[PDB]
Amino acid sequence: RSYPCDEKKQNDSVIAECSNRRLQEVPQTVGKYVTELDLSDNFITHITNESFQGLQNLTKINLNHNPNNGLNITDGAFLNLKNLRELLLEDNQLPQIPSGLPESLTELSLIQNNIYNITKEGISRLINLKNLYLAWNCYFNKVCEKTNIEDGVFETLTNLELLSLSFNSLSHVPPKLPSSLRKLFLSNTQIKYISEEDFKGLINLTLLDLSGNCPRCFNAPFPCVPCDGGASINIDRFAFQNLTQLRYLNLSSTSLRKINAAWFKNMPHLKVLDLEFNYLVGEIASGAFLTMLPRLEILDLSFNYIKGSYPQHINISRNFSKLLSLRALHLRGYVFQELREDDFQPLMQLPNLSTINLGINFIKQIDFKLFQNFSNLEIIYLSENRISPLVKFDPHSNFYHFTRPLIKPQCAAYGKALDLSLNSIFFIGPNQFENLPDIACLNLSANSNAQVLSGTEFSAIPHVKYLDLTNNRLDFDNASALTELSDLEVLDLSYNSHYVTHHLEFIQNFTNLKVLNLSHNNIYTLTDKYNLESKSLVELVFSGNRLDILWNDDDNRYISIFKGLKNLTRLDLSLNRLKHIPNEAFLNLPASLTELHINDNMLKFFNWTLLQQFPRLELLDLRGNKLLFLTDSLSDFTSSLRTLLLSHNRISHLPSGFLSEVSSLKHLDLSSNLLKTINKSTKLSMLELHGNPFECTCDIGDFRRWMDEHLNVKIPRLVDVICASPGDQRGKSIVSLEL
Ligand X SMILES: *[C@@H]1O[C@H](CO)[C@@H](O[C@@H]2O[C@H](CO)[C@@H](O[C@@H]3O[C@H](CO)[C@@H](O)[C@H](O[C@H]4O[C@H](CO)[C@@H](O)[C@H](O)[C@@H]4O)[C@@H]3O)[C@H](O)[C@H]2NC(C)=O)[C@H](O)[C@H]1NC(C)=O
Ligand Y SMILES: *[C@@H]1O[C@H](CO)[C@@H](O[C@@H]2O[C@H](CO)[C@@H](O[C@@H]3O[C@H](CO[C@H]4O[C@H](CO)[C@@H](O)[C@H](O)[C@@H]4O)[C@@H](O)[C@H](O)[C@@H]3O)[C@H](O)[C@H]2NC(C)=O)[C@H](O)[C@H]1NC(C)=O
Ligand Z SMILES: *[C@@H]1O[C@H](CO)[C@@H](O[C@@H]2O[C@H](CO)[C@@H](O[C@@H]3O[C@H](CO[C@H]4O[C@H](CO)[C@@H](O)[C@H](O)[C@@H]4O)[C@@H](O)[C@H](O[C@H]4O[C@H](CO)[C@@H](O)[C@H](O)[C@@H]4O)[C@@H]3O)[C@H](O)[C@H]2NC(C)=O)[C@H](O)[C@H]1NC(C)=O
Ligand U SMILES: *[C@@H]1O[C@H](CO)[C@@H](O[C@@H]2O[C@H](CO)[C@@H](O)[C@H](O)[C@H]2NC(C)=O)[C@H](O)[C@H]1NC(C)=O
Ligand V SMILES: Cc1cccc(-c2ccnc3c(C(N)=O)cnn23)c1
Ligand W SMILES: *[C@@H]1O[C@H](CO)[C@@H](O)[C@H](O)[C@H]1NC(C)=O
Binding site for ligand V (CB under 6 A): 219, 303, 305, 307-309, 333, 335, 360, 426-427, 450-452, 499
**Given the rule CB under 6 A, which of 24-32, 86-94, 104-112, 606-614 is the region that contacts ligand W?**
606-614
386 contributes a contact to its own copies by CB under 8 A: yes
Residue 470 sits in the site that holds ligand Y (CB under 6 A): yes
For ligand Z, the closer CB: 173 or 467 = 467
Q: Evaluate whether 117 touches 137 at the Cβ level (below 8 Å).
A: no
Q: Could you tell me if 346 and 315 are in contact, meaning their C-beta atoms sit under 8 angstroms apart?
A: no
Min CB(435)–ligand W separation in Å? 27
Q: How far apart are CA 379 and CA 370, in angstroms?
A: 14
Q: How far apart are CA 532 and CA 567, in angstroms?
A: 12
Please give the size of the binding site for ligand X, defined by CB under 6 A: 15
Closer CB to its own copies, 303 or 614, in the complex? 303
Give the binding-site size for ligand U (rule: CB under 6 A). 11
499 binds, among ligand X, ligand V, ligand U, none (CB under 5 to 8 A by kind): ligand V
250: contact with ligand X by CB under 6 A: yes
Q: Is 90 in the site for ligand X (CB under 6 A)?
A: no
Torsion of CA 291, 296, 302, 308, to 10 degrees: 0
Interface of this chain with ligand U, residues 294 to 353, rule: CB under 6 A: none
> Binder to ligand X among 51, 168, 169, 187 (CB under 6 A)?
187
Site for its own copies in 522-551 (CB under 8 A): 527
CA distance 486 to 406: 26
583 binds ligand W, rule: CB under 6 A: yes
Is 535 an interacting residue with respect to ligand W (CB under 6 A)? yes
Phi and psi, residue 105, nearest 5°: -60, 125
CA end-to-end span of the chain, whole Å?
Answer: 18
In the complex, what is the shortest distance from the CB of residue 364 to ligand V, in angstroms, rounded to a whole number? 14
Nearest to 33 by CA among 47, 12, 4: 12
Alpha-carbon 281 to chain mean position: 32
Residue number with CB closer to ligand V (38 or 274): 274
Q: What angle do CA 443, 445, 451 make, to 5 degrees?
A: 100
Using the contact rule CB under 6 A, the part of the chain among 135-143, 206-214, 491-499, 596-604 near ligand X is 206-214
Within 1-60, the residues that bind ligand W by CB under 6 A are 46
| Structural element, H or E, at residue 620 | strand 619-621
Q: Is there binding between residue 321 and ligand W (CB under 6 A)?
A: no
Residue 539 interacts with which of ligand U, ligand W, ligand Z, none, CB < 5 to 8 Å by class: ligand Z
Q: Does 447 bind ligand Y (CB under 6 A)?
A: no
From 260-268, 340-348, 515-523, 577-585, span contacting ligand Z (CB under 6 A): 515-523
| Contacts to ligand W from residues 70-89, by CB under 6 A | 72
* Residue 204 near residue 182 (C-beta atoms within 8 A): yes
Which one of ligand W, its own copies, ligand Z, none is in contact with 142 (Cβ closer than 5 to 8 A by kind)?
none
Residue among 251, 235, 234, 242 nearest 204 (CA): 242
Smallest separation, CB 339 to ligand W (Å): 25
Strand partners, 183: 162, 207
Side chain identity, residue 645: L
The amino acid at residue 656 is S
* Nearer to ligand U among residue 123 and residue 446 (C-beta): 446
Which positions from 154 through 213 interact with ligand Y, judged by CB under 6 A?
A: 183, 187, 207, 209, 211
Cα–Cα distance for residue pair 442/640, rounded to 1 Å: 38
- Determine if 143 is a binding residue for its own copies (CB under 8 A): no
Partner touching 187 among its own copies, ligand X, ligand W, none, CB below 5 to 8 Å by kind: ligand X
Contacts of 599 (CB under 8 A, 6+ apart): 574, 621, 622, 623, 624, 625, 645
Q: Which of 106, 361, 445, 449 binds ligand U (CB under 6 A)?
A: 445
Q: Which stretch, 37-45, 119-127, 218-226, 618-626, contacts its own copies (CB under 8 A)?
A: 218-226
- Residue 610 and residue 590: Cα distance in Å, rounded? 12
Give min distance, CB of 423 to ligand V, in A. 14
Q: Name the closest residue to ligand W (Cβ).
A: 536
Residue 445, contacted partner among ligand Y, ligand W, ligand U, none, CB below 5-8 A by kind: ligand U
- Min dist CB 299 to ligand Y, Å, is 12
- Full 3-state SS string of 511-571: CCCCEEECCCCCCCCECCCCCCEECCCCEEECCCCCHHHHHCCCCCCCCCCCCEECCCCEE
Which listed option, ligand W, ligand U, ligand X, none, makes contact with residue 407 (CB within 5 to 8 Å by class)? ligand U
Exposure string (b/e) for 363-378, b if CB count within 10 Å is 16 or more? bbebebebbeebeebb
Residue 17, strand partner residues: 6, 38
The C-alpha atoms of residue 133 and residue 88 are separated, in whole angstroms, by: 9
List contacts with ligand Y (CB under 6 A).
183, 187, 207, 209, 211, 248, 250, 272, 274, 396-401, 408, 410, 470, 490, 492, 494, 515, 517, 519, 539, 541
List contacts with ligand X (CB under 6 A).
183, 187, 207, 209, 211, 248, 250, 272, 274, 394, 396-400
